[PDB]
Amino acid sequence: AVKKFKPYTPSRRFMTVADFSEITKTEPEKSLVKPLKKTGGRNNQGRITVRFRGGGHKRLYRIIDFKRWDKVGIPAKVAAIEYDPNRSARIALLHYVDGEKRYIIAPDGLQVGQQVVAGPDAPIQVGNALPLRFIPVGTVVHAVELEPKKGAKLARAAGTSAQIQGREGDYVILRLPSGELRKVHGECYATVGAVGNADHKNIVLGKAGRSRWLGRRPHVRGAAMNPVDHPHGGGEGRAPRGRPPASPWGWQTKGLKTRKRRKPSSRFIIARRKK
Amino acid sequence: MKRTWQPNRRKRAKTHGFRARMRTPGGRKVLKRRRQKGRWRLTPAVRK
RNA sequence: GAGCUAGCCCUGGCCAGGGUGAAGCUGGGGUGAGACCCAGUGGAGGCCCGAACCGGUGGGGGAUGCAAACCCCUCGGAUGA
RNA sequence: GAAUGCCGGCAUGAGUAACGAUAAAGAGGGUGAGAAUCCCUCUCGCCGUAAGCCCAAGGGUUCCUACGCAAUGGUCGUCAGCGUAGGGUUAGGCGGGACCUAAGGUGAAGCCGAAAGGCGUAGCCGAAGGGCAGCCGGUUAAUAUUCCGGCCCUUCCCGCAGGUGCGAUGGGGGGACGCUCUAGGCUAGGGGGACCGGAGCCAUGGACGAGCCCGGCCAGAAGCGCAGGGUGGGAGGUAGGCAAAUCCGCCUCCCAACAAGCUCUGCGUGGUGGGGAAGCCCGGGUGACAACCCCCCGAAGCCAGGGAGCCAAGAAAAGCCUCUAAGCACAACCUGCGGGAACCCGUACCGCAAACCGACACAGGUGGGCGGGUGCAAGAGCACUCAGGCGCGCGGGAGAACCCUCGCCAAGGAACUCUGCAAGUUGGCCCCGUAACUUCGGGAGAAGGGGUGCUCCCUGGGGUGAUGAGCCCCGGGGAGCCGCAGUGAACAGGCUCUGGCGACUGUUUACCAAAAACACAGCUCUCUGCGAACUCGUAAGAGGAGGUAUAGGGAGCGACGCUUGCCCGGUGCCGGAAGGUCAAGGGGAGGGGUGCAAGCCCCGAACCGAAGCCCCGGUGAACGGCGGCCGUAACUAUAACGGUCCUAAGGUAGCGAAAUUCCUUGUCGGGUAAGUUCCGACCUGCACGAAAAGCGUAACGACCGGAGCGCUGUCUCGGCGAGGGACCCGGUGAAAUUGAACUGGCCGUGAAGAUGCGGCCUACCCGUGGCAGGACGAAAAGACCCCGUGGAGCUUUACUGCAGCC
RNA sequence: CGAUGUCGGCUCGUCGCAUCCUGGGGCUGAAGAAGGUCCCAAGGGUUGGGCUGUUCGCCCAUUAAAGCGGCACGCGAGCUG
RNA sequence: UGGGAGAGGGUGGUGGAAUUCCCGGAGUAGCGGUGAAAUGCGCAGAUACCGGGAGGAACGCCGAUGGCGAAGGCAGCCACCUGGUCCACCCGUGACGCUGAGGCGCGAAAGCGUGGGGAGCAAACCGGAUUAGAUACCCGGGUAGUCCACGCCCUAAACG
RNA sequence: CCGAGGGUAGGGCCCGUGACUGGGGCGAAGUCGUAACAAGGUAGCUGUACCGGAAGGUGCGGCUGGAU
Ligand SMILES: CC(C)C[C@@H]1CCO[C@@H]2[C@H](CN[C@@H]2C(=O)N[C@H]2[C@H]3O[C@H](SCC/C=C\[C@H]2C)[C@H](O)[C@@H](O)[C@H]3O)C1
Ligand SMILES: [K+]
Ligand SMILES: [Mg+2]
Ligand SMILES: [Mg+2]
Ligand SMILES: [Mg+2]
Ligand SMILES: [Mg+2]
Ligand SMILES: [Mg+2]
Ligand SMILES: [Mg+2]
Ligand SMILES: [Mg+2]
Ligand SMILES: [Mg+2]
Ligand SMILES: [Mg+2]
Ligand SMILES: [Mg+2]
Ligand SMILES: [Mg+2]
Ligand SMILES: [Mg+2]
Ligand SMILES: [Mg+2]
Ligand SMILES: [Mg+2]
Ligand SMILES: [Mg+2]
Ligand SMILES: [Mg+2]
Ligand SMILES: [Mg+2]
Ligand SMILES: [Mg+2]
Ligand SMILES: [Mg+2]
Ligand SMILES: [Mg+2]
Ligand SMILES: [Mg+2]
Ligand SMILES: [Mg+2]
Ligand SMILES: [Mg+2]
Ligand SMILES: [Mg+2]
Ligand SMILES: [Mg+2]
Ligand SMILES: [Mg+2]
Ligand SMILES: [Mg+2]
Ligand SMILES: [Mg+2]
Ligand SMILES: [Mg+2]
Ligand SMILES: [Mg+2]
Ligand SMILES: [Mg+2]
Ligand SMILES: [Mg+2]
Ligand SMILES: [Mg+2]
Ligand SMILES: [Mg+2]
Ligand SMILES: [Mg+2]
Ligand SMILES: [Mg+2]
Ligand SMILES: [Mg+2]
Ligand SMILES: [Mg+2]
Ligand SMILES: [Mg+2]
Ligand SMILES: [Mg+2]
Ligand SMILES: [Mg+2]
Ligand SMILES: [Mg+2]
Ligand SMILES: [Mg+2]
Ligand SMILES: [Mg+2]
Ligand SMILES: [Mg+2]
Ligand SMILES: [Mg+2]
Ligand SMILES: [Mg+2]
Ligand SMILES: [Mg+2]
Ligand SMILES: [Mg+2]
Ligand SMILES: [Mg+2]
Ligand SMILES: [Mg+2]
Ligand SMILES: [Mg+2]
Ligand SMILES: [Mg+2]
Ligand SMILES: [Mg+2]
Ligand SMILES: [Mg+2]
Ligand SMILES: [Mg+2]
Ligand SMILES: [Mg+2]
Ligand SMILES: [Mg+2]
Ligand SMILES: [Mg+2]
Ligand SMILES: [Mg+2]
Ligand SMILES: [Mg+2]
Ligand SMILES: [Mg+2]
Ligand SMILES: [Mg+2]
Ligand SMILES: [Mg+2]
Ligand SMILES: [Mg+2]
Ligand SMILES: [Mg+2]
Ligand SMILES: [Mg+2]
Ligand SMILES: [Mg+2]
Ligand SMILES: [Mg+2]
Ligand SMILES: [Mg+2]
Ligand SMILES: [Mg+2]
Ligand SMILES: [Mg+2]
Ligand SMILES: [Mg+2]
Ligand SMILES: [Mg+2]
Ligand SMILES: [Mg+2]
Ligand SMILES: [Mg+2]
Ligand SMILES: [Mg+2]
Ligand SMILES: [Mg+2]
Ligand SMILES: [Mg+2]
Ligand SMILES: [Mg+2]
Ligand SMILES: [Mg+2]
Ligand SMILES: [Mg+2]
Ligand SMILES: [Mg+2]
Ligand SMILES: [Mg+2]
Ligand SMILES: [Mg+2]
Ligand SMILES: [Mg+2]
Ligand SMILES: [Mg+2]
Ligand SMILES: [Mg+2]
Ligand SMILES: [Mg+2]
Ligand SMILES: [Mg+2]
Ligand SMILES: [Mg+2]
Ligand SMILES: [Mg+2]
Ligand SMILES: [Mg+2]
Ligand SMILES: [Mg+2]
Ligand SMILES: [Mg+2]
Ligand SMILES: [Mg+2]
Ligand SMILES: [Mg+2]
Ligand SMILES: [Mg+2]
Ligand SMILES: [Mg+2]
Ligand SMILES: [Mg+2]
Ligand SMILES: [Mg+2]
Ligand SMILES: [Mg+2]
Ligand SMILES: [Mg+2]
Ligand SMILES: [Mg+2]
Ligand SMILES: [Mg+2]
Ligand SMILES: [Mg+2]
Ligand SMILES: [Mg+2]
Ligand SMILES: [Mg+2]
Ligand SMILES: [Mg+2]
Ligand SMILES: [Mg+2]
Ligand SMILES: [Mg+2]
Ligand SMILES: [Mg+2]
Ligand SMILES: [Mg+2]
Ligand SMILES: [Mg+2]
Ligand SMILES: [Mg+2]
Ligand SMILES: [Mg+2]
Ligand SMILES: [Mg+2]
Ligand SMILES: [Mg+2]
Ligand SMILES: [Mg+2]
Ligand SMILES: [Mg+2]
Ligand SMILES: [Mg+2]
Ligand SMILES: [Mg+2]
Ligand SMILES: [Mg+2]
Ligand SMILES: [Mg+2]
Ligand SMILES: [Mg+2]
Ligand SMILES: [Mg+2]
Ligand SMILES: [Mg+2]
Ligand SMILES: [Mg+2]
Ligand SMILES: [Mg+2]
Ligand SMILES: [Mg+2]
Ligand SMILES: [Mg+2]
Ligand SMILES: [Mg+2]
Ligand SMILES: [Mg+2]
Ligand SMILES: [Mg+2]
Ligand SMILES: [Mg+2]
Ligand SMILES: [Mg+2]
Ligand SMILES: [Mg+2]
Ligand SMILES: [Mg+2]
Ligand SMILES: [Mg+2]
Ligand SMILES: [Mg+2]
Ligand SMILES: [Mg+2]
Ligand SMILES: [Mg+2]
Ligand SMILES: [Mg+2]
Ligand SMILES: [Mg+2]
Ligand SMILES: [Mg+2]
Ligand SMILES: [Mg+2]
Ligand SMILES: [Mg+2]
Ligand SMILES: [Mg+2]
Ligand SMILES: [Mg+2]
Ligand SMILES: [Mg+2]
Ligand SMILES: [Mg+2]
Ligand SMILES: [Mg+2]
Ligand SMILES: [Mg+2]
Ligand SMILES: [Mg+2]
Ligand SMILES: [Mg+2]
Ligand SMILES: [Mg+2]
Ligand SMILES: [Mg+2]
Ligand SMILES: [Mg+2]
Ligand SMILES: [Mg+2]
Ligand SMILES: [Mg+2]
Ligand SMILES: [Mg+2]
Ligand SMILES: [Mg+2]
Ligand SMILES: [Mg+2]
Ligand SMILES: [Mg+2]
Ligand SMILES: [Mg+2]
Ligand SMILES: [Mg+2]
Ligand SMILES: [Mg+2]
Ligand SMILES: [Mg+2]
Ligand SMILES: [Mg+2]
Ligand SMILES: [Mg+2]
Ligand SMILES: [Mg+2]
Ligand SMILES: [Mg+2]
Ligand SMILES: [Mg+2]
Ligand SMILES: [Mg+2]
Ligand SMILES: [Mg+2]
Ligand SMILES: [Mg+2]
Ligand SMILES: [Mg+2]
Ligand SMILES: [Mg+2]
Ligand SMILES: [Mg+2]
Ligand SMILES: [Mg+2]
Ligand SMILES: [Mg+2]
Ligand SMILES: [Mg+2]
Ligand SMILES: [Mg+2]
Ligand SMILES: [Mg+2]
Ligand SMILES: [Mg+2]
Ligand SMILES: [Mg+2]
Ligand SMILES: [Mg+2]
Ligand SMILES: [Mg+2]
Ligand SMILES: [Mg+2]
Ligand SMILES: [Mg+2]
Ligand SMILES: [Mg+2]
Ligand SMILES: [Mg+2]
Ligand SMILES: [Mg+2]
Ligand SMILES: [Mg+2]
Ligand SMILES: [Mg+2]
Ligand SMILES: [Mg+2]
Ligand SMILES: [Mg+2]
Ligand SMILES: [Mg+2]
Ligand SMILES: [Mg+2]
Ligand SMILES: [Mg+2]
Ligand SMILES: [Mg+2]
Ligand SMILES: [Mg+2]
Ligand SMILES: [Mg+2]
Ligand SMILES: [Mg+2]
Ligand SMILES: [Mg+2]
Ligand SMILES: [Mg+2]
Ligand SMILES: [Mg+2]
Ligand SMILES: [Mg+2]
Ligand SMILES: [Mg+2]
Ligand SMILES: [Mg+2]
Ligand SMILES: [Mg+2]
Ligand SMILES: [Mg+2]
Ligand SMILES: [Mg+2]
Ligand SMILES: [Mg+2]
Ligand SMILES: [Mg+2]
Ligand SMILES: [Mg+2]
Ligand SMILES: [Mg+2]
Ligand SMILES: [Mg+2]
Ligand SMILES: [Mg+2]
Ligand SMILES: [Mg+2]
Ligand SMILES: [Mg+2]
Ligand SMILES: [Mg+2]
Ligand SMILES: [Mg+2]
Ligand SMILES: [Mg+2]
Ligand SMILES: [Mg+2]
Ligand SMILES: [Mg+2]
Ligand SMILES: [Mg+2]
Ligand SMILES: [Mg+2]
Ligand SMILES: [Mg+2]
Ligand SMILES: [Mg+2]
Ligand SMILES: [Mg+2]
Ligand SMILES: [Mg+2]
Ligand SMILES: [Mg+2]
Ligand SMILES: [Mg+2]
Ligand SMILES: [Mg+2]
Ligand SMILES: [Mg+2]
Ligand SMILES: [Mg+2]
Ligand SMILES: [Mg+2]
Ligand SMILES: [Mg+2]
Ligand SMILES: [Mg+2]
Ligand SMILES: [Mg+2]
Ligand SMILES: [Mg+2]
Ligand SMILES: [Mg+2]
Ligand SMILES: [Mg+2]
Ligand SMILES: [Mg+2]
Ligand SMILES: [Mg+2]
Ligand SMILES: [Mg+2]
Ligand SMILES: [Mg+2]
Ligand SMILES: [Mg+2]
Ligand SMILES: [Mg+2]
Ligand SMILES: [Mg+2]
Ligand SMILES: [Mg+2]
Ligand SMILES: [Mg+2]
């Protein structure tokens, strides 16, 4: 339920903000935070390697449990649902009966006070983690490991999910959030349900300063530059591309496929994304 | 207006100082050159 | 060589006073329940006026200068990108 | 003898410009060889959110005192930030170190690179962040939280006593955090007092007074008081916090729970120690046994790690507390008390500036704190003033032109001009009132108008106190008084109508462009399944991202509204197991050299043999492109209609003489007395047109047009006045430039524009103030233009390579 | 070409005459008045405004008239730009 | 009070047939389409056949001249929530009724906004035929839309 | 004091008029096609949507005021 504003400034006209209605705890778990080292897009050489980064709000990193096969069989209670600024999904604070406390990304519909559990025997309930092989065909699923014991890699952003399509030997077939059809090994863990905060996509930033808050520095069109800078630079007055549209580095940017040809994972992708 | 020389003792020592020169192939050649030429000062003097 | 300048990182600091009066909340009206209307409260905003501060719009002066970019009058921003 | 040659010396311009903010000076007295310029006194003016005071940087003896004036000081100099000498900086508590970690840096392990080197977890370094114990006064020519005085405090060592399972680099807690708004109680600071203390004063018409003028505090341990912060207590279970754990976490039960209790800060009080004005008299002494009290205002500071709301979700590590591990429990640790111990470096001075950065004693630049009073609605704004600090290191006259900054102006009022450029006007607050249009916020300070001082009388509410007085903050009603004028000075919008562009706030060519340019939310296309794509790197390694398709990269478009048509033949990109071509390599029909020969050696056809290219399809918010001629209607004209050629397809909607229209000031209409601009139309659009988007759009704009009202020295058309210069006298004294000069006019001549040649004319010698026609005047080896088989940036289906990718 | 600053305006003029007006004339298809045309004449005079950067030109209102040219398309060490 | 019939409405679930596409197998010279054709598709292996998978939309027979609703309109099956309505009994209230300017709600299709979804169909559009032309009728393609959620639009031969 | 009215400024309603533009009515013998009435040669009509020289065409859903 995105929230609107009255047009009492030019920007409040279109600005929308998340409702935060699912949130129940508004300061993080001190034992589970560490500082997030802002990079500005600069690598260890000091060089910009991702342009237009820097200047956003300060953040603490919340440690997230992307394994969950860490504590097979041990139930936990959902203590709180919190805001995480490092990701689009909300996060859920888990109180294990162990006394251990851990964060997971919060699936759609997960309720404070309910229990979750991980393992081959866990019930098929929103919030439970099982190896893919034991989850019924057709189940909607998130936080999917891509290789066993390597950690949840797929379907982690707000609103996304994967659907289990069928089995073939030691692999299950998944429809990824991109629509790709992929074989993922059956021992890979996954969590029942879709990721929450599905309204995330409908937020309207509203003003230029909002992008600045997020660490997004202004993006400069190539057509605005000079030939020293960009294939689209130069020209008296405005100019069309006047060549196939290109990146600052000269490679084409409308169509040119870029996935490496002889990649081994090609044997495991059934059908490229559509739409 | 604001001119270009804005002195700073720590900056001066960290940038041109003896230890900065020794840590680097090029800096050691500077000291070698300034010794061969007979410079009274191999490095800028800052109060430190 | 980034003690000038450009960007970013870490850690600190600064922004007189006045104006406008969003959401929400409360109450009253309204209805089958509502939406919603009114009042009070409230104090939002790349909101308004204006110092510090940051600028540099127009004109005049200066032009072997007070100054290798300054001075006067005027003018933009001033809780924010 | 020339090279705009090189180095040096010395000329010219010239006693010329200038002497660095227009805050401003005058006199008396001293000193001295010498005084506008040094010292003292009186008078005058300037700053006073500073032009005063305190920190930090940077500077480095510039500080204080004596003796000096050659040079430095834009003049002078007896003076000085100058010369010579002597002196001067005192810490367990202030700052930094013997503490901590941040980015970053460095780097056992390890990784990579021809060499040099590059990376890299821990660890270490790294501060203006965390942590940590000193306040007030006195003293020196010059230091003081440092010396001294008074009262306080910290750590380390040893000892005594009491207590306890003691013990850590290990576990845990805490430290520990945003932005805006903000409560209670205080403090700093300030105002008033008919109260308290004080040297005096009565002037010039009046006043001996509830008169004037001055001051009326500061620090403080325990205790106490007020206000706040922090914190649940007990028991049982326990598999988690990489060993252990009685701690922490999780579950359960009991009690306490707007509390309490314990603990910690702030403020008040507090033994005690200090301070203590005007005036007078020589920094000092007195005043003085100084008094040291009541009322009000009141922080942005303090209690604080306080409260609330919001989204963009807000360091680490140590100190500290707790837990236990080896170990040790004759130890150790905790508490109290006592004695001892407590190192290194900084400390002078300048510090919005004559001591820092600008070559200068340079109108520029330089971060943090304090920054008093009155009035103006408020305030750090404005005027004037306190404390304090200054009059800006050339002066004296004069009272021309002209220049600068400033004031006024009859009648007119934009007639000025590219343009109302500039300058007027308007101007704060309170009340009345306010249009099209609109995205319902706005447009809006729309416009336009009325009020505004002082006096007396009456009176409403808020704060303090007591519910009153008093004080204080907002008012309200009536009646009056004065002036040309009441925000009486200073600070403080001119307004409207209508177009173009860009939605908007923002950003930019440091130093000729601030814009219509860039950015911007938003829209679309495209790549990317994660050891992602992409980027930097030879690599290792990084960024992407401790992210995962609601995400990340690239590209265009640019809020929003209504929309975005047709063409895939060419280029691009995407798909295509066929076919064609295709390199190394495979294959070896068949030849050749040599040898007596076995052999050795060489050439080599068919055929098999990737990517790429060809070929077949797809694809426009991919690169791009979107016709010609002729005919036709019962007035004419014009063609809804037709014919034919061509194309991949022949420009749709909307718009149109436009930021685009050549002809062009198109034509018509509006506005004006008059309109190449403007606005509204028309459409034969030289040469609009749909994301290099098309057409609109409220609001916004130091953008660019056009009009009107208001008002003006812009102008008719100039006048007067002020100050700083210009001018004259005293002091100091540049500059570009310069073949040399004894350097006139005309008409001719001359390399074609003559002071210099010819002829004539004119003209005694030398200056000073002015003006700019000439000396093809000066600063600059033309930047336009060409030339050079000169250079450099940029482009591409120029050539040829290379990275990269296949 | 080791620089002869370039359009328009402003200011300041000065000159030529192929004369726009004013003065003197001859001819007229000159009744008068008013014109036309040519001759002599450079003494003086030759307006304000709208448009446009404009020179020019068009237009408004006047006038005796609203002259045309030269002076580096006069004049930027005089201004504008 | 006791019963009833019903595609009345809303939410969730779920079943088979068919179409399309994808994969595997088998197989070869055409398939498709019409009045006839052509475009199209097919030796790069189509059509026709078998097995597997994916996905959306509509529910054959029953089915009627049927039923339900105020209308618009409603059809596989299942559960839940819910409206109307009729019959019986003759038990309760005691005229508590009829209509209804305004108001409010509902309102097929198409259309609009924001997300999703997209098999079939199909405005626009392209192509092939026809024709004097053919911006049509017929044929091959084909985008909105048709579907879901929420919010609008409020029309109709909304008719008996 | 009130006060006819005058002045200044800003709104509301109405009438007249305007380059040009939109369709409408009408007009003895104009041009283009033939949409409708017969199954009008594609049954017609319909609300809406999109397109086209024009009548119209097509999509979706509706009506019979449709024939056989
Ligand atoms: C049509 C036109 C293109 C012809 C052309 C006009 C331009 O110039 C003129 C050329 C002829 N030579 C002239 C010239 O060089 N003039 C110089 C000036 O430079 C500045 S004046 C400001 C700059 C102006 C002009 C510069 C080019 C100095 O002061 C002057 O002394 C002078 O050197 C012709
Ligand atoms: K040129
Ligand atoms: Mg909004
Ligand atoms: Mg609204
Ligand atoms: Mg939420
Ligand atoms: Mg921590
Ligand atoms: Mg690094
Ligand atoms: Mg990048
Ligand atoms: Mg960046
Ligand atoms: Mg993310
Ligand atoms: Mg979140
Ligand atoms: Mg796998
Ligand atoms: Mg989005
Ligand atoms: Mg952020
Ligand atoms: Mg951009
Ligand atoms: Mg460009
Ligand atoms: Mg550019
Ligand atoms: Mg570059
Ligand atoms: Mg290049
Ligand atoms: Mg390039
Ligand atoms: Mg280009
Ligand atoms: Mg360009
Ligand atoms: Mg162009
Ligand atoms: Mg450009
Ligand atoms: Mg091009
Ligand atoms: Mg390209
Ligand atoms: Mg894919
Ligand atoms: Mg600077
Ligand atoms: Mg600096
Ligand atoms: Mg330093
Ligand atoms: Mg420093
Ligand atoms: Mg430094
Ligand atoms: Mg360095
Ligand atoms: Mg060094
Ligand atoms: Mg070396
Ligand atoms: Mg070496
Ligand atoms: Mg030496
Ligand atoms: Mg050196
Ligand atoms: Mg270097
Ligand atoms: Mg710097
Ligand atoms: Mg620095
Ligand atoms: Mg501010
Ligand atoms: Mg304020
Ligand atoms: Mg106001
Ligand atoms: Mg509230
Ligand atoms: Mg603002
Ligand atoms: Mg305002
Ligand atoms: Mg300026
Ligand atoms: Mg001005
Ligand atoms: Mg200059
Ligand atoms: Mg200035
Ligand atoms: Mg000023
Ligand atoms: Mg402002
Ligand atoms: Mg402000
Ligand atoms: Mg010679
Ligand atoms: Mg010489
Ligand atoms: Mg020279
Ligand atoms: Mg030379
Ligand atoms: Mg020389
Ligand atoms: Mg020399
Ligand atoms: Mg010499
Ligand atoms: Mg010399
Ligand atoms: Mg000399
Ligand atoms: Mg001489
Ligand atoms: Mg001289
Ligand atoms: Mg001279
Ligand atoms: Mg001078
Ligand atoms: Mg000077
Ligand atoms: Mg001044
Ligand atoms: Mg002045
Ligand atoms: Mg005097
Ligand atoms: Mg004097
Ligand atoms: Mg003197
Ligand atoms: Mg003297
Ligand atoms: Mg003086
Ligand atoms: Mg003196
Ligand atoms: Mg005197
Ligand atoms: Mg003051
Ligand atoms: Mg120095
Ligand atoms: Mg001297
Ligand atoms: Mg002297
Ligand atoms: Mg001497
Ligand atoms: Mg001197
Ligand atoms: Mg000087
Ligand atoms: Mg003397
Ligand atoms: Mg000293
Ligand atoms: Mg001490
Ligand atoms: Mg030590
Ligand atoms: Mg350390
Ligand atoms: Mg190498
Ligand atoms: Mg190394
Ligand atoms: Mg270091
Ligand atoms: Mg350290
Ligand atoms: Mg520190
Ligand atoms: Mg300390
Ligand atoms: Mg103390
Ligand atoms: Mg002291
Ligand atoms: Mg103990
Ligand atoms: Mg915390
Ligand atoms: Mg934290
Ligand atoms: Mg901090
Ligand atoms: Mg915030
Ligand atoms: Mg106090
Ligand atoms: Mg006060
Ligand atoms: Mg006290
Ligand atoms: Mg345990
Ligand atoms: Mg504290
Ligand atoms: Mg005494
Ligand atoms: Mg403050
Ligand atoms: Mg605090
Ligand atoms: Mg708090
Ligand atoms: Mg750390
Ligand atoms: Mg033991
Ligand atoms: Mg023992
Ligand atoms: Mg030591
Ligand atoms: Mg000191
Ligand atoms: Mg300053
Ligand atoms: Mg300061
Ligand atoms: Mg000084
Ligand atoms: Mg001076
Ligand atoms: Mg200065
Ligand atoms: Mg005071
Ligand atoms: Mg005020
Ligand atoms: Mg002075
Ligand atoms: Mg001054
Ligand atoms: Mg002076
Ligand atoms: Mg004189
Ligand atoms: Mg006067
Ligand atoms: Mg006048
Ligand atoms: Mg006027
Ligand atoms: Mg007037
Ligand atoms: Mg005008
Ligand atoms: Mg202009
Ligand atoms: Mg204008
Ligand atoms: Mg004025
Ligand atoms: Mg004013
Ligand atoms: Mg109006
Ligand atoms: Mg209005
Ligand atoms: Mg208007
Ligand atoms: Mg409008
Ligand atoms: Mg409105
Ligand atoms: Mg007003
Ligand atoms: Mg009044
Ligand atoms: Mg008065
Ligand atoms: Mg104003
Ligand atoms: Mg703009
Ligand atoms: Mg712009
Ligand atoms: Mg635009
Ligand atoms: Mg717009
Ligand atoms: Mg925009
Ligand atoms: Mg702004
Ligand atoms: Mg603004
Ligand atoms: Mg420039
Ligand atoms: Mg510039
Ligand atoms: Mg420059
Ligand atoms: Mg400028
Ligand atoms: Mg510009
Ligand atoms: Mg601007
Ligand atoms: Mg720009
Ligand atoms: Mg924009
Ligand atoms: Mg848009
Ligand atoms: Mg999109
Ligand atoms: Mg690279
Ligand atoms: Mg990172
Ligand atoms: Mg990372
Ligand atoms: Mg992106
Ligand atoms: Mg842009
Ligand atoms: Mg609109
Ligand atoms: Mg094409
Ligand atoms: Mg094609
Ligand atoms: Mg193509
Ligand atoms: Mg082209
Ligand atoms: Mg082409
Ligand atoms: Mg169209
Ligand atoms: Mg036109
Ligand atoms: Mg025109
Ligand atoms: Mg236009
Ligand atoms: Mg054009
Ligand atoms: Mg034209
Ligand atoms: Mg033209
Ligand atoms: Mg005209
Ligand atoms: Mg007209
Ligand atoms: Mg027009
Ligand atoms: Mg025309
Ligand atoms: Mg384009
Ligand atoms: Mg263009
Ligand atoms: Mg437009
Ligand atoms: Mg607008
Ligand atoms: Mg603007
Ligand atoms: Mg602007
Ligand atoms: Mg005007
Ligand atoms: Mg004047
Ligand atoms: Mg004067
Ligand atoms: Mg004289
Ligand atoms: Mg002299
Ligand atoms: Mg000579
Ligand atoms: Mg001579
Ligand atoms: Mg002479
Ligand atoms: Mg002469
Ligand atoms: Mg000649
Ligand atoms: Mg001559
Ligand atoms: Mg001569
Ligand atoms: Mg001669
Ligand atoms: Mg001679
Ligand atoms: Mg001769
Ligand atoms: Mg001669
Ligand atoms: Mg002669
Ligand atoms: Mg003569
Ligand atoms: Mg003279
Ligand atoms: Mg002179
Ligand atoms: Mg001259
Ligand atoms: Mg001149
Ligand atoms: Mg010459
Ligand atoms: Mg000359
Ligand atoms: Mg000359
Ligand atoms: Mg020059
Ligand atoms: Mg040359
Ligand atoms: Mg040159
Ligand atoms: Mg040439
Ligand atoms: Mg050549
Ligand atoms: Mg040659
Ligand atoms: Mg060349
Ligand atoms: Mg080159
Ligand atoms: Mg190479
Ligand atoms: Mg690539
Ligand atoms: Mg030349
Ligand atoms: Mg020369
Ligand atoms: Mg020249
Ligand atoms: Mg003029
Ligand atoms: Mg007659
Ligand atoms: Mg004459
Ligand atoms: Mg003209
Ligand atoms: Mg001309
Ligand atoms: Mg003309
Ligand atoms: Mg006449
Ligand atoms: Mg002339
Ligand atoms: Mg000429
Ligand atoms: Mg010419
Ligand atoms: Mg000229
Ligand atoms: Mg000039
Ligand atoms: Mg000129
Ligand atoms: Mg000149
Ligand atoms: Mg000259
Ligand atoms: Mg075959
Ligand atoms: Mg599908
Ligand atoms: Mg009964
Ligand atoms: Mg409806
Ligand atoms: Mg479709
Ligand atoms: Mg019917
Ligand atoms: Mg009257
Ligand atoms: Mg029909
Ligand atoms: Mg018919
Ligand atoms: Mg029909
Ligand atoms: Mg027919
Ligand atoms: Mg059609």
Q: How was this structure determined?
A: X-ray
Could you say which DSSP state residue A35 is in?
E
Bases of chain C below 7 A from a protein C-beta are 1-5, 7-11, 22-23, 44-47, 69-70, 80-81
Could you say which DSSP state residue B41 is in?
-
Distance A236 CA to ligand 1 centre (A): 28
Dihedral of CA A104/A105/A108/A113: which sign? positive
Whether any strand D atom is under 7 angstroms from the Cβ of A95: the reply reads yes
Residue with tokens 């930033």: A205
* A101-CA/D415-C1' distance, Å: 89
Q: How far apart are CA A89 and CA A85, in angstroms?
A: 9
Resolution in A: 2.5
C-beta separation of A80 from A112 below 8 A: yes
State which amino acid sits at residue B9: R
Neighbours of A180 (CB within 10 A): 16
Dihedral of CA A227/A231/A236/A238: which sign? negative
Kindly give the pairing relationship between strand A91-96 and strand A76-82.
Answer: antiparallel
* Tokens describing residue A224: 């605005």
Whether any strand F atom is under 7 angstroms from the Cβ of A165: the reply reads yes
Residue (of A87, A98, A199) closest to A143 by Cα position: A87
Distance A134 CA to ligand 124 centre (A): 97
* A236-CA/E10-C1' distance, Å: 39
Residue with tokens 């003097």: B45
Q: How many residues are listed for chain A in this entry?
A: 275
Taking the CA of residue A273 as centre, how many other CA atoms within 13 Å lie in the half-sphere pointing to its CB?
7
A234-247: burial string, b at 16+ Cβ within 10 Å, e else: eeeeeeeeeeebbe
* Tokens describing residue B35: 């010794």
State which amino acid sits at residue A135: I
Neighbours of A132 (CB within 10 A): 24
Whether any strand D atom is under 7 angstroms from the Cβ of A175: the reply reads no
For chain A, what percentages of helix, strand and coil (3-state, to nearest 5) are there?
10, 25, 65
* Tokens describing residue B7: 């002195």
Taking the CA of residue A38 as centre, how many other CA atoms within 13 Å lie in the half-sphere pointing to its CB?
12
Question: B13: which nucleotide lies closest, measuring CA to C1'?
Answer: C3
Whether any strand F atom is under 7 angstroms from the Cβ of A166: the reply reads yes
Dihedral of CA A70/A76/A78/A79: which sign? negative
C-beta separation of A154 from A66 below 8 A: no
* Tokens describing residue A39: 């990079």
* A37-CA/F160-C1' distance, Å: 79
Q: Which residues pair with residue A25 across a beta bridge? A: A82
